[PDB]
Structure formats: structure tokens, C-alpha cells
């Protein structure tokens, strides 16, 4: 019941911004979207639930930190993204987005 609501909330927000280009720091700006993952939406949603604080935001119906969620899912799943991204800078950006949204 709770789970269903959390997942629909996350799915709704990711679907709404599926092709929006977010900015990530590169090793050498990396632009990326959810579409580029080439992941099914349910797999993206499952993965997004492990971003600390995201499940709780989704349960409250709050605005998600989507650039952060995308960076995390891409870091965990996309070999290309992992190669291109500056991972330390990414972690700081992800943490700050999370501080701002929670």
C-alpha cells in the first residue's frame, strides 16, 4: 500500500522528466537523461529507491532531486556514464542536492 504509493510517485516524476538533460561533472559538462540509461522504468524506479532519503520524499509526495537520482542510477548501471563522470565531484553534488531536498 505504502510501497505502491512510493513507487507510483517516483515513476510519475521520472516519467515526467524522462528526457530532461541534467548536468553532471566530467573527468575532462556531461549531459545525461533517464532515457540514455536504456533501463526499463521499473528497474529505474527500484534503483531510485536506494538513493538515501528518496523513498521518504516520495512517500510524502514531495519533489524529488532528479539530477541526483539519475546520477546515482547511472553511476550504478551505465559503464559509459561511469567512464565519463568525475565520481568525487558527483558524490559532493549528490550529497548537496540531498541536503537541499530533505
Swiss-Prot record:
The modification Phosphoserine is found at residues 19, 78. A motif (Nuclear localization signal) lies at residues 20-23. Belongs to the lyssavirus protein P family. Coiled coil: none annotated. It comes from the Viruses. Non catalytic polymerase cofactor and regulatory protein that plays a role in viral transcription and replication. Stabilizes the RNA polymerase L to the N-RNA template and binds the soluble protein N, preventing it from encapsidating non-genomic RNA. Also inhibits host IFN-alpha and IFN-beta signaling by binding and retaining phosphorylated STAT1 in the cytoplasm or by inhibiting the DNA binding of STAT1 in the nucleus. Might be involved, through interaction with host dynein, in intracellular microtubule-dependent virus transport of incoming virus from the synapse toward the cell body. The lineage of its organism: Viruses, Riboviria, Orthornavirae, Negarnaviricota, Haploviricotina. Phosphorylated by host PKC and by an unknown kinase. This is Phosphoprotein.
